[PDB]
Amino acid sequence: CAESDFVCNNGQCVPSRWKCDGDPDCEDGSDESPEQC
Numbered sequence: 001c002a003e004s005d006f007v008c009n010n011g012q013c014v015p016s017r018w019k020c021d022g023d024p025d026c027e028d029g030s031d032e033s034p035e036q037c
């Protein structure tokens with residue numbers, strides 16, 4: 001992934017925009033965990 005793109009634990013490149021967005025973009029769903037949002 002590029003230097004400006006966040007990496008999920010599986011290697012998926014997801015923009016920095018899509019944190020706590022409501023959408024399970026990362027396969028493990030760690031970015032969308034309710035406790036950390």
Ligand SMILES: [Ca+2]
Nearest residue numbers: 018021023025
């Ligand atoms: Ca997401």
